[PDB]
Amino acid sequence: TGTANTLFGTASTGTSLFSSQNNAFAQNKPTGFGNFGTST
Amino acid sequence: TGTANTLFGTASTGTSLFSSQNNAFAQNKPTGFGNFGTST
Amino acid sequence: TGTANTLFGTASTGTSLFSSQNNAFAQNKPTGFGNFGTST
Amino acid sequence: TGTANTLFGTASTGTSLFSSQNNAFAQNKPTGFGNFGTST
Amino acid sequence: TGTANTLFGTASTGTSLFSSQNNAFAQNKPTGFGNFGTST
Amino acid sequence: TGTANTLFGTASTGTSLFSSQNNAFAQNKPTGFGNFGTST
Amino acid sequence: TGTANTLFGTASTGTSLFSSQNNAFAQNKPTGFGNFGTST
Amino acid sequence: TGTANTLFGTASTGTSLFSSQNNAFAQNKPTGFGNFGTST
Amino acid sequence: TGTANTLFGTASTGTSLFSSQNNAFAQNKPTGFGNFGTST
Amino acid sequence: TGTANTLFGTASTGTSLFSSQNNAFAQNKPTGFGNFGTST
Amino acid sequence: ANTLFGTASTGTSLFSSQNNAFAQNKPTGFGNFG
Amino acid sequence: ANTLFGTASTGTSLFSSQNNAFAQNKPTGFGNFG
Amino acid sequence: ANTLFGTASTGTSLFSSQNNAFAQNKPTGFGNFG
Amino acid sequence: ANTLFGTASTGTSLFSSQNNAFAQNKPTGFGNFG
Amino acid sequence: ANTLFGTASTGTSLFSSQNNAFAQNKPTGFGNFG
Amino acid sequence: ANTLFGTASTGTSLFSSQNNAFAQNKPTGFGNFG
Amino acid sequence: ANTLFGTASTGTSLFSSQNNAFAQNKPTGFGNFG
Amino acid sequence: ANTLFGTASTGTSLFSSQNNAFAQNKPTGFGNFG
Amino acid sequence: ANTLFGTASTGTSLFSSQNNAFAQNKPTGFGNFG
Amino acid sequence: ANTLFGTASTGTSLFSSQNNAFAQNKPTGFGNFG
Amino acid sequence: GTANTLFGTASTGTSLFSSQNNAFAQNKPTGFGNFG
Amino acid sequence: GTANTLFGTASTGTSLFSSQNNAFAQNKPTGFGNFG
Amino acid sequence: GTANTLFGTASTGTSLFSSQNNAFAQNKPTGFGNFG
Amino acid sequence: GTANTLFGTASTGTSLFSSQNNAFAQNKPTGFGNFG
Amino acid sequence: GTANTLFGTASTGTSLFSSQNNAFAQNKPTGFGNFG
Amino acid sequence: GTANTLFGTASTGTSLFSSQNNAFAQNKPTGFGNFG
Amino acid sequence: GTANTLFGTASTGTSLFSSQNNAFAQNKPTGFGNFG
Amino acid sequence: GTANTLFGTASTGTSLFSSQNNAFAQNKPTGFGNFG
Amino acid sequence: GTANTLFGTASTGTSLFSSQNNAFAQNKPTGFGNFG
Amino acid sequence: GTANTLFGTASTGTSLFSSQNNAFAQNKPTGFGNFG
């Protein structure tokens, strides 16, 4: 809820739910998430 | 909910749900998400 | 919900659901998402 | 819901659902999404 | 829902569902989406 | 739903469903979407 | 809730729920999350 | 709740729930989280 | 609740719940968390 | 609650609940936490 | 006296977008001079 | 006296977006001169 | 006297986004001169 | 005298986002001159 | 005299985000000159 | 005289985030000149 | 005279985050000149 | 004269975080010149 | 004269964090010149 | 004259953390010049 | 040399003494004054 | 040399003595004054 | 040499004596003054 | 040499005597003064 | 040599005598003064 | 040699006599003064 | 040699006589003075 | 040799005569004075 | 040789005659004075 | 030889004649004086 202010970069204030960030020089099959089976 | 303000970059205030970001120099089959089977 | 304001860049306030961003120098078969089977 | 205002760039306030962005220098078969089978 | 205003660029407020953007220097068979089989 | 106003660029407020944008310097067979078989 | 302000970098104030970040020089099958089966 | 301010780096004030960060020079199958089965 | 201010580094004031950080030179199957079965 | 200020490093004032940090030169299956079964 | 009764209900919306703009007294004047 | 009764209900929205903008007295004047 | 009765209820929203903006007296003047 | 009665209730929201902005008297003037 | 009655209740929110911004008298002037 | 009655209650929130910002008289002026 | 009545109650919050910011008279001026 | 009545109660919070910031008269001026 | 009545009570908090910041007259000026 | 009535009570806190910061007149000036 | 855009502006000739004032709000922006 | 963008601006000719003032709010921004 | 962007600006010609003033709020930003 | 970005700015020509003033608030930022 | 970014700025030409003043608030920031 | 970033800035050409003043608040920051 | 970052800055060319003044508050920070 | 970071700065070229003044508060920090 | 960090700075080129003044408060910190 | 950190700084090139002054408060810290 508080004010974010950078000068050169990223100012974030939001809520990030479920964020995957796999990051390398070399990767083999990087997956973010799996399958989503939703019922109602 | 708070104010974001950069000068050179990214000011974000929104809510990011389910964000995958796999990033390398070399990748092999990077997937974000899987299958989505939704029923109602 | 809060105000975003950059000068040179990206000011975002919206909600991003399900965002995949796989990004490299070299990729092989990068997929964002899978199959979408939806029934009602 | 909050005001976005850049000067040079992207001000976004909308909600982005299901956005794939695979981006490299060299890619081989980058797919955004899969198949969409929808029934009602 | 909030006001977007850039000066040089993109002000967006709409909701973007299902947006693929695969973009490189060199690509081989980049597909956005797959097949769409819809029944009712 | 909120007002978009750029000066030089793109102000968008509409909802974009299913938008593929594969764009490179060199491409080979870039397809937007697949086949559309719809029955009723 | 308090104000964040960097000059060169990342000022964050938002709440991040469920954030995986596996990052190396070389990885083999890095997954962020698993499967999501949700019912209501 | 208190003000964070770096000059070159990361000023954070938000609450981070459930953050996994496994990071090496070489990894083999690093997973952030497991499966999510949620019912209501 | 108190003010954090570095010059080169990380100033944090937020509350971090449930943060795993397993990090080596070489790892084999580092997991952050396990499975999440939640009911209501 | 008191002010933290480094010059090169980490100034922290927040409360960290449940933080695992297993870190070596070589590890084999380092897990942060176990399974989370929550009911209400 | 002018009245507007407006409703816009959707039921079971999947992968959809609904924008509802209930504006009351929204004038737009481009050039107001004097 | 002008009144607006506005409602926008959705039921069982999956993977969806709903934007509801209830504005009252929202004028927009581009050039106000004098 | 102008009144706005606004409601926007959703029930059982999965993976969704709801934005509700209840603005009252939101003018926007680009160029105010004199 | 203008009044706004605004409510935005959700029930059983899973993996969702709700933004509720109740603004009262929010003007925006770009160029105020004199 | 303008009044705003605002409420935003959620019940049983799992893995969700709720942002509630109750602002009263929030003007924004970009260029104030003289 | 302008009044704002604001409430934002959640009941049984699991793994969730609630941000409640009750601001009163929050102006923002970018360039104040003279 | 402007008044704000603000409340944000949660009941039975598990693994959750609640941020409540009750600000009164919070102006922000970027460039104050003269 | 402006008043703010603010309360933020939680009951039975497990593994949770509550931040409550009751600020009164918190201005922020970036560049004050003259 | 501006007043702030602030309370933040929790009952039965397990494994939790509560931060309560009751600030009164907290200005922040980045560049004060002259 | 501005007054702040602040209270933050917890009852039966297990394995918890409570931080209560009651500051009065806490200004922060980064660059004071002249 | 040559300049290729697909969208946007491709410009080849050199550009000298160019003023531009970009804001959301400007009071008396000038590029140039008087010559001689 | 050559300049290739797909979107945006590709510029090849050199650029000398260029002023630009970028803000959200400016009081009397000038690029240049008087010549002789 | 050559410059390739996909989005953004690709620029090949050299750039000399360039002023830019970037802020949220500026009082009398100048790039350059007077010549002779 | 060559410069490749996908997003952002790729620049090949050399850059000499460049001023930039970056802030949230500036009172009279100048890049350069007077020549001769 | 060559410079490759995916996002951000890739720059190949050398950079000499460059001033930049970065703050949240600046009173009269100058890059350069007068030449001769 | 070569410089590869994925995000951020990749720079190959050498950099000489560069000034930068980084603060939250600066009174008259100068990079350089006068030449001759 | 070569420089590889994933995020941040990869720099290959050598850097000589570089000044930087980093603070939260500075009164008249200078990098360099006068040349000749 | 070669320099690999994942986050942060990878730098290969040598660095000579570099000044940096790091504080929370500085009165007249100088890197360098006058040349000749 | 080679330098590998995951986070932070990996530096390969040698560093000679480098000054740095680190404090919370400094009155006139200098790296270097005058050359000739 | 080679230098491996996971977090922090890995440095391979040799370092010669380096000054650093570390305090909470310094009055006129100098690294170096005058050359010739």
Author numbering:
A (entry chain P), B (entry chain M), C (entry chain J), D (entry chain G), E (entry chain D), F (entry chain A), ...: 85 to 124
K (entry chain C), L (entry chain F), M (entry chain I), N (entry chain L), O (entry chain O), P (entry chain R), ...: 88 to 121
U (entry chain B), V (entry chain E), W (entry chain H), X (entry chain K), Y (entry chain N), Z (entry chain Q), ...: 86 to 121
List sentences from the manuscript.
The human nucleoporin Nup98 forms fusion proteins in certain types of malignant leukaemia, is a critical component of the permeability barrier of the nuclear pore complex and is mislocalized in cytosolic deposits in Alzheimer’s disease. Key to these Nup98 activities is its large FG-repeat domain with a high number of FG motifs. All four fibril types display a parallel in-register β-structure comprising short and kinked β-strands.
To gain insight into the molecular organization of cohesive FG-repeat interactions, Nup98FG85 was allowed to aggregate in pure water. Using cryo-EM, we determined the structures of four different fibril polymorphs (pm1–pm4). The most abundant polymorph fibril, pm1, was resolved at a resolution of 2.8 Å and is formed by three asymmetrically arranged protofilaments. The structure of the most abundant polymorph, pm1, deviates considerably from the flat two-dimensional (2D) arrangement of cross-β-structure sheets. This leads to one chain forming contacts with several layers of the opposing protofilaments and the formation of a cluster of phenylalanine side chains (bottom). For example, the aromatic ring of F102 contacts three other phenylalanine rings located up to three layers away. The pm1 structure contains a large cavity that is predominantly lined by polar residues. Because the Nup98FG85 fibrils were prepared in pure water, it is likely that the cavity is filled with water molecules. We obtained values of approximately −20 kcal mol–1 per chain for the four Nup98FG85 fibril structures.
